Enzyme design. Structure first.
Site, short mmCIF file in Angstrom:
data_model
loop_
_atom_site.label_atom_id
_atom_site.label_comp_id
_atom_site.label_asym_id
_atom_site.label_seq_id
_atom_site.Cartn_x
_atom_site.Cartn_y
_atom_site.Cartn_z
N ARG A 150 48.57 45.86 45.18
CA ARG A 150 49.83 46.55 45.73
C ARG A 150 49.18 46.90 47.38
O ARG A 150 51.34 47.30 47.75
CB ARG A 150 48.59 47.82 45.14
CG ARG A 150 48.73 48.58 44.22
CD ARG A 150 50.24 48.16 43.54
NE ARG A 150 51.34 49.20 44.04
CZ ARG A 150 51.55 50.43 43.49
NH1 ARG A 150 50.30 51.72 42.18
NH2 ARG A 150 52.96 51.66 43.80
N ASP A 170 49.15 33.40 46.71
CA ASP A 170 48.12 34.66 45.67
C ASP A 170 48.10 34.16 44.86
O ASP A 170 49.18 34.09 44.06
CB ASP A 170 49.15 36.03 45.87
CG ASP A 170 47.64 36.96 45.52
OD1 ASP A 170 46.62 36.29 44.85
OD2 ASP A 170 47.98 38.45 45.09
N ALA A 230 42.52 44.99 56.20
CA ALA A 230 42.21 44.46 55.40
C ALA A 230 40.43 45.23 54.86
O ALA A 230 40.12 46.13 54.53
CB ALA A 230 42.80 43.52 54.04
N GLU A 260 30.47 46.98 60.86
CA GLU A 260 30.74 47.99 61.50
C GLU A 260 29.45 49.05 60.93
O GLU A 260 28.94 49.05 60.34
CB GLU A 260 32.90 48.91 61.28
CG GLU A 260 32.28 48.29 59.91
CD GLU A 260 34.37 48.81 59.28
OE1 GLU A 260 34.83 47.15 59.78
OE2 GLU A 260 34.61 49.32 58.63
N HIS A 278 38.70 51.49 62.12
CA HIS A 278 38.86 51.53 60.30
C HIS A 278 38.90 52.83 59.73
O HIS A 278 38.71 53.33 59.17
CB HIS A 278 37.50 51.39 59.45
CG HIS A 278 37.63 51.12 58.11
ND1 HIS A 278 36.34 50.48 57.58
CD2 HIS A 278 38.49 51.63 57.08
CE1 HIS A 278 36.67 50.19 56.77
NE2 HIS A 278 38.05 50.42 56.43
#
Lengths: 527, 527, 106, 105
Positions: A150, A170, A230, A260, A278
């Site tokens: 998406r 992909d 991502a 993180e 992020h």
């Protein structure tokens, strides 16, 4: 007696207005454990953000809990296994961040191409270093989208309006779906060679982790700008720094880190690398949507209605007769996908014999979950079929037949290719323990545990092949637990499937392929 | 003031109970013209079977008519053009006979394989000629289904349970759809060679008429039994008789005739040929369903709701701005289908420029209607997209863009192949007369009338090719009205499209192909 | 199956009327099988095979045979009944050699 | 005489889009042969044959039929010029009302 919806993190009443007037909504300070545990006994539903941890302790303490709803995409703060274990439906808001994340990828790509932070810093230090900067123009360039879920799709749509040519990698989108998007599907190697910009949009799975390593970075075009908003680590952080410093990749943008909180990355010492903590979903609109999404899921769930955004199975959702089949059928989907040359356009699930009397639509979802595991994160068990069909171009159907030829019940997964070719894999359960068995592959019958590391080989040079394979494997120290092999009914080919106690190193796989002249060699973990 | 539903043929009140309590239902003797014309002025809806003719006279006389509903599949007794001309929605019951027709095909196949009528006749003449008969067993045999629409699909499903292997010929079903059905798709020649039984399930279109002629009959397996309960003439009646008499085809069953009423066929002199007077839908269940179907269509239509089974366009259904585009876009679908190597898995319709501001979903249906014309009967204009997608495996979408590059509005039809290849065809309308123009094929631009017989050639031998083609055509007496030709941007190829005043005989097509070394040669009628 | 369909669609009579060069289309009216309940009396092998071919027409199958394996019956898509219940529920009946020859009744 | 042009697309390619009420979409470049003639069977064949026979390659061509009349009008973009005698022969072969060649570079 109105049902109780407990909100344990910062979701506004307005954000959650999709709940009817048919519920009592209460709030609690979720992060405060004493408060939470005192408030939850009465809860029929629990909504949570990221700050409250919904562990077994919480669940044990909530005897009438029917739904745990996470207003977000991640499920790190919820023990989905424990929730399933107790028949509690878990839900998230799986598409709530997509626009904010796409926009942030674009934000990072532009911020890196035009050095916005550094430039802003120079003016912030009250100097004018206009002559120092030199940006990169997007118009006319080729942009490689690595992963066309998406979000990668939205990024491609936005970047295409800049006059960029879009290519994608992909293996989990059909060629016809990519063509409908007006996107050229490429091998990763070819995307690397061609792309002036790279945006990564993969999920984190071990299929995915560190995908873009030094080897990959070295194949890119000199001057590439690379963005990852991502998952931490998709692009090897140290390899990037190397490539950035060496000059080969001009700039990068990162919103996510191998681990993180991250405060000590070497990348933070590099100007040509734009970084954000992020922030991809740090938007009022995305947080509001996460909430209104999950408020609707909770409504449907309390209305005994069907919950598209469900993440697991809990409640009446599934019979005791059917329930054990879910995991087997997931494994059949994995297998049918591995045995296929490319992504099937559809899965036909045939349910035969006694099981055919049951309600088995969930089995169709299991198959799809299995087929797509390489792009699905572990916690999720259910996936939304309509969304999958629209996003990636693959569908599934169920067919029932009263008769099963041999076992009292069998499930066959037919993976159908766009060219009309078909790969078939079957399993049953039987016995006091209901052990999962793979019982057929493409017209060949056998009885093998659906578990562990399985090696599958289609090959052409037959005599002594069993010896060659078993000897190479055993020289590598690999134990062979079980095996199934047969010479093709028609043709020069033969096939073999082996359960191993460990994975097979690449060199030895190459040796085996060479030794028996294989045309297909795969290793799949069915655990 | 309750809306009036006039029933002019024999449909029972119970059959039509799907109409609400919100309508006044009246009956009239439809076949009696005076009665009908006197009753129709007040009608908001008119339901009819086959006995009432709904011509222009009827329509002119019914000033508030909103719907004409035919309880059946045929539309011979309704002037759909006149109804569209006056904004009257026409509907049928397109799937009401499918089970009765499938069952009748099977009935005819068994009745022919086992000589039921003759045998029944011998016992009816009070004699015992058991020794005389010899039937044919279906188990294990190959059955060729010629045409895999809904009914051909049901026949394949029923025949497969007899232990027969099923093959099919249908260029208008995707390979993936056939594979989902577990059916092998074949060229007609290969089906002919392989089939022990043949069941035809084509519509009547000139693409279809007399498909199975003497040439075809001679390719079949000796001993074939052939059934046609589809359309009169699909199998050449005289050629069949020849093949039956000569012995090569053992038996046949026919429910339909080149012209009916049919009382004088030579086939009627042949015992080995089972015949029925077009009985395929002569079933209480099929007639009841036709009625309850159409009663629901009439409900939806009176409820201002959307009518899936609509056959044409009538009413608010479509703006004045959009309306003229329907026919152009149908022609783009025809064209995209002809220019495609095989059936696209989908059509993407892009609407660009001024037209993009309109409501244009119907354009998606037009494209599909065009793509599938070879298997759609003329009267129908609309087709049911969801049903088409499920039956044949092809979908369509619409995409809008504010900008059109050149014309103020353009519609592009992208036909996408399962392999991700794409064929693009574009048209516009412009001018006081809104003439329909084809303006692009696969990145080549031009301006040609969307009308008449068009010849399209992709070919490889270039120099003097224009001369060769025009000289062959003109020696055949064929006028060339307009033309568009260009050498490919990349490659040895070239392409040309010509509007002709007549079709091109096969030998001359062969000559042209040979002369310029064509890889694709097609003739399509865009009228 | 052939006979069941020929009796359902009056094939022999329909074929005859054409053989005497008449168009008697409006004289015929058949019975559709789809969705109907089919009774199989006796489940020797031929009966079992009939049940299976019948089910593919979308009919529900019930049968009377008190010596057939219930598990075999269910695998065949068959609902086992007393003969009384079969007669009550059946739109079509096919009679067959039973599993236990030959104390079949009449 | 009326001639029309437009520009469109990312390159802004120049297109000849109309001559005297007939529509086309041809690049405004190179050597272009324009013919207005009497449509007979064989006519386009003769034009092509003569050009080919002369070694003149056609890069693109578009022909349209007149709205009302015996006539037709074609534009061919050619890889080289057409010798006078060949233009004459072409003209005769098809009863051309007009035949002209123009460099549009």
């Amino acid at each position: 007696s109105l049902p109780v919806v407990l909100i344990a993190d910062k979701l506004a009443p307005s954000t959650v207005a999709a709940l009817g007037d048919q519920v009592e909504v209460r709030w609690v300070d979720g992060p405060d454990r004493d408060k939470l545990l005192a408030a939850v006994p009465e809860a029929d539903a629990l909504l949570v953000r990221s700050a409250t941890t919904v562990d077994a302790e919480v669940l044990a303490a909530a005897p009438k809990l029917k739904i745990v709803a996470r207003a977000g995409v991640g499920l790190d703060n919820v023990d989905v296994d424990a929730a399933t274990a107790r028949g509690v439906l878990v839900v998230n808001a799986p598409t709530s961040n997509i626009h904010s994340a796409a926009e942030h990828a674009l934000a990072l790509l532009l911020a890196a191409s035009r050095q916005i932070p550094a430039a802003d810093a120079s003016l912030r230090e009250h100097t004018w270093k206009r002559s120092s900067f030199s940006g990169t123009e997007i118009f006319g360039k080729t942009v490689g989208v690595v992963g066309l879920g998406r979000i990668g799709q939205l990024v491609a749509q936005r970047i295409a309006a800049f006059g960029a040519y879009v290519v994608a990698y992909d293996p989990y989108v059909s060629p016809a779906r990519a063509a409908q998007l007006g996107i050229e599907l490429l091998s990763l190697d070819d995307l690397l060679a061609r792309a002036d910009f790279i945006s990564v949009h993969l999920p984190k799975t071990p299929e995915t982790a560190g995908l873009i390593d030094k080897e990959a970075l070295a194949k890119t075009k000199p001057g590439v700008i690379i963005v990852n908003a991502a998952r931490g680590g998709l692009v090897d952080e140290a390899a990037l720094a190397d490539a950035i410093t060496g000059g080969h990749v001009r700039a990068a943008g990162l919103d996510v880190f191998a681990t993180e909180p991250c405060t000590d990355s070497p990348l933070f010492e590099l100007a040509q690398v734009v970084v954000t903590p992020h922030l991809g979903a740090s938007t009022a609109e995305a947080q509001d949507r996460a909430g209104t999404d999950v408020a609707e899921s909770v409504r449907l769930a309390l209305a005994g209605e069907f919950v598209p955004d469900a993440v697991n199975v809990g409640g009446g959702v599934v019979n005791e007769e059917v329930a054990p089949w879910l995991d087997l059928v997931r494994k059949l989907g994995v297998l049918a996908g591995v045995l296929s040359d490319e992504l099937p356009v559809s899965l036909s699930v045939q349910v035969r014999g006694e099981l055919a009397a049951e309600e088995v639509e969930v089995l169709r979802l299991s198959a799809l979950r299995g087929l797509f595991s390489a792009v699905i994160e572990d916690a999720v068990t259910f996936v939304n079929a309509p969304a999958l069909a629209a996003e990636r171009g693959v569908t599934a159907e169920i067919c029932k037949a009263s008769e099963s030829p041999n076992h009292r019940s069998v499930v066959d997964v037919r993976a159908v290719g766009a060219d009309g070719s078909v790969v078939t894999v079957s399993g049953t359960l039987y016995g006091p323990q209901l052990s999962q068995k793979i019982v057929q592959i493409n017209g060949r019958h056998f009885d093998l545990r659906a578990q562990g590391i399985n090696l599958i080989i289609h090959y052409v040079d037959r005599p002594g092949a069993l010896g060659k394979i078993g000897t190479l494997l055993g020289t590598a120290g690999v134990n062979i637990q079980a095996a199934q092999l047969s010479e093709d009914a028609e043709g020069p080919g033969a096939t073999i499937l082996l359960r191993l106690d460990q994975d097979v190193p690449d060199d030895v796989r190459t040796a085996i392929a060479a030794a028996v002249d294989a045309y297909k060699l795969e290793v799949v973990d069915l655990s």
